[PDB]
Amino acid sequence: MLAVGIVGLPNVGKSTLFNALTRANALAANYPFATIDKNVGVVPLEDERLYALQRTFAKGERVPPVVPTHVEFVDIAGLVKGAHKGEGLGNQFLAHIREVAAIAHVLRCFPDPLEDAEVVETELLLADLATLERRLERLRKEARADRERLPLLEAAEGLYVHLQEGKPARTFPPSEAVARFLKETPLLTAKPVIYVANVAEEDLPDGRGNPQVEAVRRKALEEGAEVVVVSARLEAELAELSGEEARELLAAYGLQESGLQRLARAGYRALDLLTFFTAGEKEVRAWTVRRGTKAPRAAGEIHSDMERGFIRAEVIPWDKLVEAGGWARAKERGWVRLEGKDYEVQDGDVIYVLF
């Protein structure tokens, strides 16, 4: 699942954060099928570029509607710390973690958070060490018969040293061999991690001077995780209001973006995603693809057909389309590019597929 799994030990504010997330999910324009699950929802991603494009294509009294994209979050369910005696405690949690692309761990930083982080990390490490032991045995046999498997075996040898020292796969230095191994065997500790420091509202936006948040930032550096500071209670309260009123009251408190939006943006980065747009008089919409996605696959997101039927596409940075004043005007300015099947989409690109 192209989603962020939210985890938390008892009483850290996770259910409160999910009251907010479930409310936000009821605002979505399009729902991924996975959201049928009560534990899966999305947070619409606010993007001012949509409104900028909207003004560019508004004519007379007509204004095209805007459709934002979103980031999917899963409430990871399950007891975390098992006995490892074959009884099965903790198995459901691991199974759920396997299905998400990134992990966001809620840590309580208001009346030890590092202890919670280590508890979860320890269970993920134990599962990964077992996976590595199984792969080392299998790969060593396969490599003797097919040298093409050797790089994965050598990457696994290195990761095993790293994990045996209690370090996550995500902080192991990158290399071609490690990349091939992790694509085939997606270790739990290789998933990007966001530590969500839950604080009292007075500590927003960065938990400055809050020793618990500072300790979380220190641990994050060691674990290769990013940090987002939110007040779950505040987010739940704001989510009950209209977006306009919530923004005004937030600004009155000297805060410029909700914690849910900050979390959504952190999740977007963790999942290595980028936004591209389709824009015209009828509609302006934001689409999401993984960084590295080429024009054809991008086109496939808009219309399945277009991927195979893809011949070429007009592409222009949203800011240049806005600066020009429209498609006809951007063409005249020579700012509209015709890109082929080899083109890697860039964040902010506006695309119109030919055929």
Q: Pairing relation of β-strands 102-108 and 193-198?
A: parallel
> Interface with ligand GDP includes 10 (CB under 6 A)?
yes
CB of 10 to ligand GDP, least distance (A): 5
Q: How far apart are CA 146 and CA 37, in angstroms?
A: 42
> Interface with ligand GDP includes 12 (CB under 6 A)?
yes
Specify the residue, 184 or 257, whose C-beta has the smaller distance to ligand GDP. 257
Residue from 5, 14, 42, 169 in contact with ligand GDP (CB under 6 A): 14
At a CB cut-off of 8 Å and minimum separation 6, what does 214 contact?
A: 207
> Interface with ligand GDP includes 200 (CB under 6 A)?
yes
Q: Quick one: which segment of 219-227, 229-237, 240-248, 267-275 binds ligand GDP (CB under 6 A)?
A: 229-237
Q: Where are the alpha helices (H) located in 257-345, listed in sequence order?
A: 259-270, 295-302, 304-308, 318-324, 327-332
CB of 100 to ligand GDP, least distance (A): 18
Q: Where are the alpha helices (H) located in 28-78, listed in sequence order?
A: 48-57
On whether 108 is known to bind a ligand per the annotation, the reply is yes
Specify the residue, 108 or 285, whose C-beta has the smaller distance to ligand GDP. 108
> Interface with ligand GDP includes 207 (CB under 6 A)?
no
> Interface with ligand GDP includes 16 (CB under 6 A)?
yes
> Interface with ligand GDP includes 15 (CB under 6 A)?
yes
Q: Which of 78, 71, 182 is nearest to 120 (CA)?
A: 78
> Interface with ligand GDP includes 8 (CB under 6 A)?
yes
Q: How far apart are CA 100 and CA 92, in angstroms?
A: 13
Specify the residue, 197 or 279, whose C-beta has the smaller distance to ligand GDP. 197
Q: How far apart are CA 173 and CA 273, in angstroms?
A: 21
Specify the residue, 16 or 56, whose C-beta has the smaller distance to ligand GDP. 16
Q: How far apart are CA 171 and CA 188, in angstroms?
A: 12
C-alpha 35: how far from chain center? 16
Number of Cβ within 10 Å of residue 333's Cβ equals 13
CB of 198 to ligand GDP, least distance (A): 5
Q: Name the residues that contact ligand GDP, by CB under 6 A.
A: 8, 10-16, 110, 198, 200, 231-233
Annotated binding site: 11-16, 108, 198, 231-233
